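Final report, results section. Input specification for complex C-07:
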Amino acid sequence: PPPPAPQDVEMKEEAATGGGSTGEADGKTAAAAAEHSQRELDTVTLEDIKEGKEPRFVLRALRMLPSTSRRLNHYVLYKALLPFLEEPMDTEADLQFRPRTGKAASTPLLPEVEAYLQLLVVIFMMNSKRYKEAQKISDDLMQKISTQNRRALDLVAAKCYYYHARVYEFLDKLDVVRSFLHARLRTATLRHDADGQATLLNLLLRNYLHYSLYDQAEKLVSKSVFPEQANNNEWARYLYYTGRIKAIQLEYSEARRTMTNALRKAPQHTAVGFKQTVHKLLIVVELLLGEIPDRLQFRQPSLKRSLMPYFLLTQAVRTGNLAKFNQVLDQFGEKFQADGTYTLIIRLRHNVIKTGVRMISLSYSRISLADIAQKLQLDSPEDAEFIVAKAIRDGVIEASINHEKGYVQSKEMIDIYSTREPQLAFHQRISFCLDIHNMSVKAMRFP
Amino acid sequence: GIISLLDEDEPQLKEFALHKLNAVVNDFWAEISESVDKIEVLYEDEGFRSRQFAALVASKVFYHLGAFEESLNYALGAGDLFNVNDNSEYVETIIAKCIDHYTKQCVENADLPEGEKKPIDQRLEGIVNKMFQRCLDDHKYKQAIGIALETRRLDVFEKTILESNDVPGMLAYSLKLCMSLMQNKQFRNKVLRVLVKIYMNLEKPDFINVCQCLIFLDDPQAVSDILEKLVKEDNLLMAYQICFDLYESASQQFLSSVIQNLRTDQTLKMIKILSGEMAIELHLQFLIRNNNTDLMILKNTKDAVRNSVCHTATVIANSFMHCGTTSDQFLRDNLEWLARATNWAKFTATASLGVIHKGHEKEALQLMATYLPKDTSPGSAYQEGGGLYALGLIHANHGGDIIDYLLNQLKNASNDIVRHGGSLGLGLAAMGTARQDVYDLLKTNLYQDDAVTGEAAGLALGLVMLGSKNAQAIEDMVGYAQETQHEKILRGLAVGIALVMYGRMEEADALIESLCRDKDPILRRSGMYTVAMAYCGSGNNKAIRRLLHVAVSDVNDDVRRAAVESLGFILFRTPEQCPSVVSLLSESYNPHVRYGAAMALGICCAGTGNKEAINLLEPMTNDPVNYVRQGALIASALIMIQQTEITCPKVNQFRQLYSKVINDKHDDVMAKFGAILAQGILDAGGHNVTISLQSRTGHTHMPSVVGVLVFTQFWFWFPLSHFLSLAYTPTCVIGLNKDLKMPKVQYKSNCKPSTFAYPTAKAKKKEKNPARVMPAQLKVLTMPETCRYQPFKPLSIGGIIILKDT
Amino acid sequence: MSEKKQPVDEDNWDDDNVEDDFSNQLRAELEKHGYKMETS
Amino acid sequence: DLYSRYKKLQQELEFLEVQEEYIKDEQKNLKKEFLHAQEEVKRIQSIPLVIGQFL
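Structure output:
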């Protein structure tokens, strides 16, 4: 008695969404798609949520003259796989409705990802995407009829390339798909820019920081910026991956602002630990700064089972205990090697000394050297002059050593009062504000 | 990590290294991306024996990046591997953009046509003609004509007619295709002549070849070529088409060009073709047999007596249905209402005898042998002016020997109340003739010291100098146009100096600026009429930029009105854009731009079955301004002609709407003047005759440009309301074989009887008088395959074709 | 929402700043502090 | 028709991009016109106004 209901509403899924998309895509260009055609993301993740089932919607696909009304109603009525996923090509070649080729080569095929048998149909999904990649290649050699693949099926295409990813990942890696991607880039570079490269580039970094390491420098020459960032979700996790990069490129002062940006551009919900687990390794760069506040302003108790190392670790950060250092290391270094954590163990001592020198430096105008050699667990006055020079290391607040015997003649620095440095920066503040005025201009330009 | 291998200068490991390069080239993109310098080291080496494949791995890294001039350099220094490797997106994208570099290289090669061009690699064009050999073996006419005109070069285009055992139509439709798209004339002249050369030397003698280049290339030598040949093989059933096209399509001064080529039977034929009587009297025969009009509605508006311009409206409305019928009724049934108005209705009333008996060419002079200017009355000098005006309507657009005799009558006459009609008829029959006696008396016509003859002097000098590129007449005119005393003098001379240059496309632009610069409203207004006439029928943005700007920024409103008047004058080849572009122009501030907007949709969308122009003229004919309602009735007349009843259902709605506004008294008199004159426009011959900006030949017609542009502003001189009647062609077909030999041919169309019905499924012809028809009811006919007389030349629209006596 | 990597992966709690400040620093908060004045 | 369609799409494009500029200029113009409307109508001020009553 429940399955006759998706016979109605799962039918109206393709009726409303797909029928409106294809029919309203046949005209009214660029309102052809992208007013409910790329409702596709959540309505088709929902198709994989909202609801035997496997052969039914994949038989008898390409018929004739547009009788999909009757054919999808047959798919409704029939509720009472070896050539079956290829049967949308085996009834006849599709031969009409080229906006429907990728659509029916995505939406019926993909629910086996959520069926999870992983043994016989992932190679059949590989074959179904050999068909759909034959569409992808043959759109410019055999389909010289109209656009139908940029304005609708490019936004469909990047989605089903994430589904390519979902298929390719569950068994192996991909290498041929990378030059195949850059060919897809070349047929999206100058004509019509798609994300695409950034999709499999997120995957590139995701499997490469696991397994290849030359390619950040190849990103450097490959950094076509793509300032469109329309979803902002892909762009958010793009910033997450490259912030892991600059953490492993040991770039920290950039990392704090760009990863705080990457967090605040996540509007996400569902507190299973998505935002939380991404955010923990995000503010590992703040563990690497030398400065981090108490993480009470960051914890969701669903993350608590994973951060059972992490709270005691930030305790070790705020303290300086070598016992706590090594104990958190050996005991609580599990579950983070899967993410990669052991670059903080070399410089947790640096975190200690920068936290201490921050407290003491903003605390004290003048300090003495052979007592700042005993504020923290320092070693010697030669180690203390050493660590004063290493405490500068970049251009920190004025600390001149009293170069006879007066240990240090440091003082506080001034002229941040309200004089020229803020009005040196306010041109750029209002440069950002006029950029938002350009956003207002484009707000007017949206119709 | 191969720059370590690039430390070696011996190439004997560099073959292994380049085999590594194209192996892991997808992974090591940033390897070469700074190593471009060492790529240039191995490239510019004259001992490294893989500098071409070094240019290919350079093509790989600059395919990863996508550079253009690098791909030009790889066209240079990749050589053989640049040429034979062409089955890949990796190569076809970069060589596609190199073909784009080649097509802008051809843009450069068409920028300056005389030597000294930019250098060309023989390989960037080697891939052009190499890919073009695929186009020749593909043999598709797209593949020929596309790349043959992408290059903008006549050599490979000349080679495209040399393809395989086909081309039944390129050698007859190639000129059709090239005219159907052309924008530049600089090489179009050469393409149009090199095609008709091989059409003269075709296996088949063709007629559309010189039928097209005789009016778009207008050579005196080509008309002498077809004269020479079509007389030389001694047949005139084949010279039938093109000699009667010489009279029927071509305009004046091209007849001068051929009469230079006449003498050097067909002797009697070349005597009679430049006379050109047969079209005139078949028009006359058609209208005297085809009086499908109504006199009852003429009574229903004859009853609406007012002393004003309504008399002219009535006599022009029945002249519209009798121009070429030799038939009067309102010159007959009355004398008191006929002589009600004074001194201007007499001009118009004796002018209507010339309008109606236009198409009565030789005999209308003895028809007015009683009605000479000095026989009837020396009291009204406008009566004796309308007299010679009507003799100019006797010699309307095709005069004879009596052009010079009207000139002899214009040697001595009254001061100026004669030349207003006389010189207009003289330059009307003497279009572009550059005559000397018209220059003679037009000198003193300029120096009359009277403003009422400015139209005479200016307009007639522009007529006889249509497309002059003169200076001295223009010097006289515009340099007299800073110091005179009125503006009828200024404005007659202004539309005359508009009329002095035509179809220039680059040449009148000096005068365009010269008229542009002054603070004279009338002179910049003349500049707008001049940028119309020099740029007619072509969508040149060089007009519309300055027209756009002057129709926004200036508040001087006469020149703004002229700017929104030039639109259909320059864009009537494509009338299907004017609503979307004059839409808010119909909602301006002044009567000028609103009035010219109504007229813009009118003169633009003539032959359209649009009805959007109708729907937008609806709030224009219900406007608050009075004479824009007048002009909107006139624009309703403009839209409804080259349109029938079933082309738009508001035709009778506008007939009864004209009736509503004119047959009541309480509406606006000035705004109901247009209603019955517009009815007459609507019943020109009873929809037999209509306006014709565009021929089957494509040769535009001088009344249907010149007369309608003069007809635009008509308050300023009321006899400017006649000239649209001179722009009439009967919608009928000629399937005649011998010049009078009546056929036995009655063929049909698959249309409705009611689409045929003009106030069974098959159509019925009349065995040539010609037979009236919709213009759109000529592409839906069917040849008589059961007739004894079968036509051979395709008859898609009106005009003349050949028949065969079988 | 599977974002392609992440599926693989005021009771007593605002005081935590003060408490982690005060873990090994003034762990009694008074029992030395009330007894400081007779140290010197 | 890929030589003539690709010819004339460019043509109608350059047409409409010219034709945009007209209305861009008129939108520049009419805001000034509306300001002239505002102040040159609101010179309806106290020309020596009389005291009365409203009913």
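Residues 118 and 697 of chain B are 39 Å apart (CA to CA). DSSP finds 43 helices and nine strands in chain B. This concludes the modelling results for the funded period.
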